[PDB]
Ligand SMILES: [Ca+2]
């Protein structure tokens with residue numbers, strides 16, 4: 001399907017000004033004009049590839065007088081010649097006619113065997129040229145300095161790819177034509193086989209000869225294809241270390257990928273929040289588990305892997321540490337190499353969500369290691385109610401397109417450990433939480449002034465990178481992420497890159513960046529950060545708050561209400577930074593009665609299967625609705641955001657909601673309900 005030969009077609013006479021770059025699967029190297037105006041006249045054209053077969057052959061084309069043909073560097077056209085079953089031969093073909101009266105080029109390629117069967121060279125005996133930074137022992141490689149297949153001028157001057165029903169075209173970019181048609185205009189360094197410096201050529205990327213599992217956005221030459229993994233623990237379950245009654249504490253967790261300032265760190269970490277709610281009694285966990293001073297405890301949890309990246313992993317999963325406190329590693333989760341039941345795809349889990357999560361200590365695994373804590377680690381644990389999950393960047397082997405057989409395959413000689421150094425070396429990183437408020441990294445090829453090779457890649461402008469990498473557009477002129485204006489998110493950098501940007505603005509006589517993004521330029525090693533303005537973000541850049549206005553507003557559209565609970569319409573996004581609600585009744589004088597006056601009893605919201613939110617007033621009022629012994633009493637519901645979420649009885653022990661900073665979001669009389 002992606003096999004055959006590779007044609008350059010120049011409008012000029014000498015392979016100087018390339019019009020179309022394409023491939024035919026059989027011998028017929030034609031191109032109907034039905035597939036292309038003042039430029040549709042090729043005065044020269046080249047064709048490159050190999051050939052496999054045993055017999056005595058004679059090559060003939062439909063123009064043995066405009067052509068030259070070499071098989072393994074020997075001339076054959078400007079006569080019979082022997083070939084052998086099970087060997088490949090280079091194949092170069094040139095063409096030149098001085099004033100082609102027609103548009104396009106009709107040109108087939110024949111071969112006649114010994115029985116005299118002449119014909120066009122089947123697609124089964126035709127293979128591409130080995131466009132790859134290195135030569136195989138079967139195939140060798142030789143206006144394509146980086147050898148990626150896309151001709152130099154084209155890679156410098158821009159090029160587009162029209163996806164015809166058989167094969168693809170690669171042609172110069174033209175404003176009047178493709179600009180209206182909305183075809184994506186490409187550019188890329190002619191001296192990088194791959195410009196985002198990853199493992200797919202600038203050629204494989206645009207022509208679809210690439211691991212299908214790679215992100216559509218990373219199909220761009222300047223958008224970097226590479227994995228990004230983190231471990232999403234989904235919940236947890238604690239035991240006393242060794243015939244007594246089941247004495248454990250099972251609780252959900254919430255895990256978010258993190259980035260600590262922007263900061264030049266390339267690590268993969270995420271941070272677990274063990275739920276602090278109510279699971280009968282206000283017992284300490286040792287009181288809940290019969291743990292003594294000199295006891296031990298052990299941990300278990302279902303965890304999935306998360307690729308928030310653009311390339312996929314195949315045979316080796318990255319090794320995690322379960323750290324507690326700042327640096328106390330309780331465990332080291334490993335997966336069994338070259339044995340991955342499935343692949344882990346970008347924007348996707350392993351095990352898939354339709355399947356089970358991994359348990360740290362799987363059912364019948366006799367070699368699963370006890371994750372143990374001493375006593376003061378266990379207190380420590382309850383105190384902080386949180387564990388971190390650092391994950392290396394050993395990702396194993398890569399699925400590289402094979403040219404000879406036009407098939408994508410895991411390739412043993414190509415490892416992700418030999419590529420990340422340079423991706424992260426010669427690209428500028430961006431981190432955006434615009435999607436479901438999660439930190440999502442990406443990287444874009446950007447000029448490295450103090451490095452001559454990185455000054456051969458096209459310029460990358462802020463406005464552009466957002467569009468190629470993250471999919472902004474400008475439907476009416478203003479730049480947008482799936483609805484939201486680019487002004488809705490803020491810009492953080494790290495320090496060197498901040499200075500850098502600052503400087504540029506003074507130069508453009510600009511005072512506001514949002515209105516000069518197109519003019520801002522991106523250099524390699526830049527780190528950038530972009531977060532929805534509506535929110536407060538902790539030191540790990542996770543969303544953990546909001547304005548009192550943002551929240552109150554969010555909850556303003558109430559649907560129904562009753563002495564049994566509120567039924568609102570709240571944004572999935574707001575709903576992500578809320579940790580619970582408080583319910584109280586205000587008598588006529590001003591006293592307040594707290595229906596659920598505990599720090600682990602605030603979990604009374606439950607998202608319906610219809611998208612709306614219901615606030616179960618009954619859940620902690622003893623399954624009873626609310627009793628209002630005077631209609632002029634008010635029913636007041638505050639909201640509590642994660643940043644003001646108490647998770648342990650105060651210093652004096654008071655386990656009430658007393659003191660908790662919360663937000664009034666609903667108030668009505670007994671008679672207003
Ligand atoms: Ca090239």
Ligand SMILES: [Ca+2]
Pocket residue numbers: 146148150155188189190191192193194195202
């Ligand atoms: Ca290139």
